[PDB]
Design an enzyme around this catalytic site. Structure first.
Site, PDB file in Angstrom:
ATOM      1  N   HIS A 102       0.820  -1.246   0.000  1.00  0.00           N
ATOM      2  CA  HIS A 102       0.000   0.000   0.000  1.00  0.00           C
ATOM      3  C   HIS A 102       0.839   1.276   0.000  1.00  0.00           C
ATOM      4  CE1 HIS A 102      -3.923  -1.731   0.356  1.00  0.00           C
ATOM      5  NE2 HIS A 102      -3.789  -2.135   1.607  1.00  0.00           N
ATOM      6  N   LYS A 104       2.855   4.549  -0.778  1.00  0.00           N
ATOM      7  CA  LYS A 104       2.792   5.486  -1.888  1.00  0.00           C
ATOM      8  C   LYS A 104       3.972   6.427  -1.694  1.00  0.00           C
ATOM      9  CE  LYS A 104      -1.887   4.343  -2.411  1.00  0.00           C
ATOM     10  NZ  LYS A 104      -2.069   3.472  -1.273  1.00  0.00           N
ATOM     11  N   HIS A 327      -9.100  10.291   0.760  1.00  0.00           N
ATOM     12  CA  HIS A 327      -8.266   9.092   0.653  1.00  0.00           C
ATOM     13  C   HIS A 327      -6.947   9.289   1.406  1.00  0.00           C
ATOM     14  CE1 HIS A 327      -5.718   6.152  -1.588  1.00  0.00           C
ATOM     15  NE2 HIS A 327      -6.838   5.446  -1.610  1.00  0.00           N
ATOM     16  N   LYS A 329      -4.896   9.492   4.864  1.00  0.00           N
ATOM     17  CA  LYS A 329      -5.067   8.941   6.209  1.00  0.00           C
ATOM     18  C   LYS A 329      -4.196   9.770   7.121  1.00  0.00           C
ATOM     19  CE  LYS A 329      -5.263   5.279   3.277  1.00  0.00           C
ATOM     20  NZ  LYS A 329      -5.710   5.636   1.920  1.00  0.00           N
TER      21      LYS A 329
END
Length: 441
Positions: A102, A104, A327, A329
């Protein structure tokens, strides 16, 4: 400003809410540096779209895509990249079930130096179009001269910690990037790296990753204040894992316990979780399709209805983004009146055991399924005891080095009795969205 925390551009808000936001084309622009090569760590890729975000003069430079896809998904990504001779792929190993890659991050090597970008968006058009997403931009890190011996390390240990994160992949393409990082001076970095990698960590390694990594940094580099028990914890996320049959199984035992750590010494702490309601999604810029990026399943939700009493609506008037579904967090520790924060974390990690880690073997081992990555802003790394919250995200506050840009409204607002958490695989056929449609999965 010292923080270099940005939101992505949102199409359709007034220009004052995009002035100071970044689109991917801005990040990759020649103004940020003369690109030699790049690495794109992500989950989801639209390769045709991604190459078009690079300046035309840089589109043939080497690009490494770091992903976690297997089997037919892996073949699909390879087929996307096949037209582009300059694109290489690195498949991150995922040797624990139900884990994903996950993280990025962009590693951008320039003629002039190196930059690291840690962010929250997939490399697809919709993630950069009408969503609230977060970006941390590193300084331009200069090269250390041939023949010079210096560490290039920051007071937050960011260089060694980034190398440690990349070493965990055990991948030859990333050893090349490790060697690039070794050659640059990252000493100006003022954030702490918080990563998750898959594994079972015991002993000397338990504090390297996930929520124990957060706990260790807060123990070592934050101070407790009187009445710390009244400073809430806020967590804000776009997906919810299976947390167990009650709050003591994980959320308010080991996860909250890490998040409330401050300082070295030895709970009624309020816990606010921010997650979009159905009405937030219906009335958003994208309408119900924004919910395809909020993947909470009815099968998971109906196992943990206790969780939803912690849920607060998405609201972001401070950044003009109440209708731009999150989107990003983020996790933070506000004061009781929400005027200050003890720390702020932006990350790829959602509210899940896979991302943050779950204790096993009688509390001696932390097991993590996924790769995640985020950066932690601690006041001590800026010569401060706390951060004052910026009142308006894109505004010019009299002390920007003391004033942290929180992208959503405080205090968070509890769901009303008619609100429900967005659950993506049940239908919503009572009221249409901003495009005139219902949601029929």
């Amino acid at each position: 400003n010292p923080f270099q925390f940005y939101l992505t551009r949102v199409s359709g808000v007034k220009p004052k809410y995009n002035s100071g936001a970044l689109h991917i084309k801005d990040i990759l622009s020649p103004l940020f540096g003369t690109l030699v090569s790049s690495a794109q760590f992500n989950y989801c890729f639209d390769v045709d779209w991604l190459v078009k975000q690079y300046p035309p003069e840089f589109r043939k430079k080497p690009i490494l895509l770091v992903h976690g896809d297997k089997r037919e998904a892996k073949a699909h990504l390879h087929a996307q990249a096949k037209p582009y001779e300059n694109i290489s792929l690195c498949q991150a190993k995922l040797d624990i079930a139900f884990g994903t890659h996950h993280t990025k991050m962009m590693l951008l090597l320039y003629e002039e130096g190196l930059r690291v970008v840690i962010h929250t968006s997939n490399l697809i058009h919709a993630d950069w179009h009408q969503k609230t997403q977060g970006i941390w931009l590193s300084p331009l890190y200069p090269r250390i001269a041939d023949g010079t011996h210096k560490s290039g390390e920051s007071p937050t240990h960011f260089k060694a910690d980034l190398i440690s994160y990349l070493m965990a992949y055990n991948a030859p393409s990333l050893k090349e990037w490790i060697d690039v990082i070794h050659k640059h001076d990252l000493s100006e970095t003022n954030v702490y790296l918080i990563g998750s990698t898959p594994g079972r960590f015991q002993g000397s390694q338990k504090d390297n990753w996930g929520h124990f990594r957060l706990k260790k940094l807060l123990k070592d580099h934050a101070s407790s204040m009187p009445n710390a028990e009244s400073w809430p914890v806020v967590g804000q996320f776009s997906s919810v894992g299976s947390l167990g049959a009650d709050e003591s199984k994980w959320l308010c035992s080991e996860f909250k316990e890490s998040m409330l750590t401050l300082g070295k010494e030895s709970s009624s702490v309020p816990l606010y979780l921010i997650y979009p309601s159905v009405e937030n999604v219906r009335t958003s810029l994208e309408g119900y399709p924004a919910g395809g990026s909020l993947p909470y399943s009815i099968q998971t939700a109906e196992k943990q209805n206790w969780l939803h009493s912690y849920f607060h609506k998405w609201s972001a008037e401070t950044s003009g983004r109440s209708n731009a579904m999150p989107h990003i967090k983020t996790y933070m520790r506000p004061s009781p009146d929400f005027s200050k924060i003890a720390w702020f974390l932006v990350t790829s990690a959602n509210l899940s055991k896979a991302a943050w880690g779950a204790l096993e073997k009688n509390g001696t081992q932390l097991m993590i399924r996924s790769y995640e990555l985020g950066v932690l802003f601690l006041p001590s790394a800026f010569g401060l005891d706390s951060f004052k919250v910026k009142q308006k995200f894109f505004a010019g506050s009299q002390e920007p080095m003391a004033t942290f840009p929180v992208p959503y409204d405080l205090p968070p607002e509890l769901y009303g009795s008619k609100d429900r958490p967005w659950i993506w695989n049940i239908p919503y056929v009572k009221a249409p969205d901003t495009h005139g449609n219902m949601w029929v999965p």
